Paper text:
ADP-ribosylation is a reversible post-translational modification involved in various cellular activities. Removal of ADP-ribosylation requires (ADP-ribosyl)hydrolases, with macrodomain enzymes being a major family in this category. Further analyses reveal DUF4804 as a class of MavL-like macrodomain enzymes whose representative members show unique selectivity for mono-ADP-ribosylated arginine residue in synthetic substrates. Crystal structures of several proteins in this class provide insights into arginine specificity and a shared mode of ADP-ribose interaction distinct from previously characterized macrodomains.
Two of the representative proteins in this group, CG2909, and CG3568, are from Drosophila melanogaster, indicating potential evolutionary connections between the prokaryotic effector and the eukaryotic proteins. Encouraged by the clearly detectable ADPR-Ub hydrolytic activity of the two metazoan proteins, we solved their crystal structures in the ADPR-bound forms (ADPR-bound CG290912-498 at 2.28 Å and the ADPR-bound CG356825-508 at 2.00 Å). The ADPR interactions in both CG2909 and CG3568 are similar to those observed in MavL, with di-phosphate-binding loops and catalytic loops matching the sequence motifs identified from our search. In addition, water molecules equivalent to w4 in MavL can be found in both structures with distances of 3.4 Å (in CG2909) and 3.3 Å (in CG3568), suggesting that this macrodomain class likely employs a similar catalytic mechanism. Adenosines in MavL, CG2909, and CG3568 are sandwiched between two residues and stabilized by π-π (in MavL) or π-π and π-cation (in CG2909 and CG3568) interactions. In MavL, the adenosine was stabilized by π-π stacking interaction provided by two aromatic residues (H142 and Y265), whereas in the two Drosophila proteins, a π-cation interaction involving an arginine (R198 in CG2909 and R209 in CG3568) replaces the imidazolium stacking. In Arg-specific macrodomains, the core β-strand connectivity appears to be the same, yet some distinct differences are observed: In both CG2909 and CG3568, expansion of the variable regions from β7 to β9 (compared to β4–β5 in MavL) and the additional β12–β13 were observed. Interestingly, CG2909, CG3568, and Larg1 all harbor a hydrophobic residue (F137 in CG2909, F148 in CG3568, and V77 in Larg1) equivalent to F105 in MavL in their insertions. Note that MavL, CG3568, and Larg1 harbor a glutamate residue (E107 in MavL, E237 in CG3568, and E160 in Larg1) at the same position that does not interact directly with the distal ribose. On the other hand, our study also tapped into the protein-level specificity: MavL interacts with Ub and effectively removes ADPR from ADPR-Ub, whereas Larg1, CG2909, and CG3568 exhibited rather weak activity hydrolyzing ADPR-Ub.
Residue numbers in the entry: 25 to 262, 269 to 506
Write the structure that this text describes.
Amino acid sequence: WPGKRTNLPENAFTQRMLQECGQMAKPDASVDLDNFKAISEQSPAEFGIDSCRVKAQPEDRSDRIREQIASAYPVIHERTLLLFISFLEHKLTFGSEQEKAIYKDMTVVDLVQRLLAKRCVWFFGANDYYRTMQGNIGNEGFEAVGTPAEKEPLTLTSVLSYDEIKLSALLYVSCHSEFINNGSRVNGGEVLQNKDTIEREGVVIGLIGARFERPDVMEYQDIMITKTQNTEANGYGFSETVTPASDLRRIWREFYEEPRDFIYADTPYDTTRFEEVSQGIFDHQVMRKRYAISFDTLLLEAQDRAFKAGKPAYIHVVGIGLGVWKAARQQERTFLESFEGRLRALGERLSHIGVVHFSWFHLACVGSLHDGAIIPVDKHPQGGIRIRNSVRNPGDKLTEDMLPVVTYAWDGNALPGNEFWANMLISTGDPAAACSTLISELQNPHINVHYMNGANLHIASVEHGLLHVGDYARRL
Ligand SMILES: Nc1ncnc2c1ncn2[C@@H]1O[C@H](COP(=O)(O)OP(=O)(O)OC[C@H]2O[C@H](O)[C@H](O)[C@@H]2O)[C@@H](O)[C@H]1O
Ligand SMILES: [Cl-]
Ligand SMILES: [Cl-]
Ligand code: NI
């Protein structure tokens, strides 16, 4: 899961949304480096350091940096695209007055631009410490966004709803970028005397794990089963009138192609699927599917980048969701089970994946994934995908001639780097990635405005590969 075949909904609203996608053209605005740097100096959030910025890079790197800037895009799974459409339909029918008025004329591309542009600058912790684009700082209050009890400064026109942030956890960012240092957790933006020990550049991908810190929102709604959340009143377990909550459960269940969700007392006694945790029950079957969406996007993206680079990809894989967001003891095993599954399902498509390197994992071996293993790939020019499992720094120099594809653990409601923008330069993987690359500008929708935008959305499709959304919709 997911399957290779996607089903096209026949209803007029979906057909119209796809028609509009099929009218989009790829942006091709010439990159003006001086214009970029000026935009960056006027960005609505302050940089604690400049060493990870375009302006601090050598002049002899300007040509490549211009290409890196134009190489950036947001990217979602083809199934995520259909989910976004179904979300718009659901909110236009069941949303509040506040929600209905902002989604009224919104296209798919517009919703994606909103998820990029209206996310907070930072947003971290179980109690939602935040800075909005308008500079307001506080804790909590996002549960009320987009409801008739919403209030300044957390209103739908300014910030995202938790229902939207849950969507945004499926929206990833990718670009080529200079590497400043080896990108260790504690790099803190340090500059090196020379880059003899590191790769000079590569692909950097912001992926987002599942978040369970905050009850009754995000992936907790789908994967966590608790006594207070999983009730008939909240739309679970479904001669009953449809409610907004129950309809929203249905579109997420249909996204995961699950035939039911659960009332707490109705959950089967089955430890191959369910794990008891402090909050209640953790459903590793739906967790595997949520991972599979992220991993499909990553692998199809890495394949496309590597094919255009003319060399195999070396993927630095991090445990998204397994750090400060770790929520179950078997979760890392579900992670690796899911990843092996997608490597095998995608099969011959991954001709240009060379090494998958799991960095900072506690399990040495899950299924066939252990250090030195090779997953065979039909017609792969090197016979298969090499697996590694050991700590490395993402920017370390490669002994093979391969394209480094560096993942970092991001956040659905924060700019790349997240607490980086609160001047916490050493914390989690997120500020470490911002400090050691150019993504704090190149993946920033308020700085890389011509390429990090909804109109440049790309789609990862099992059948059609990685395509700009216009090309993808036209092939449907
Ligand atoms: N010193 C280390 N060096 C490298 N990897 C490490 C280290 N310590 C832990 N890991 C592993 O690093 C991996 C990633 O752990 P995390 O960075 O917490 O990510 P998440 O997805 O759980 O939390 C994301 C949120 O935290 C940020 O604020 C974001 O913006 C979000 O708000 C795990 O395998 C860890 O075991
Ligand atoms: Cl500096
Ligand atoms: Cl050098
Ligand atoms: Ni083996």
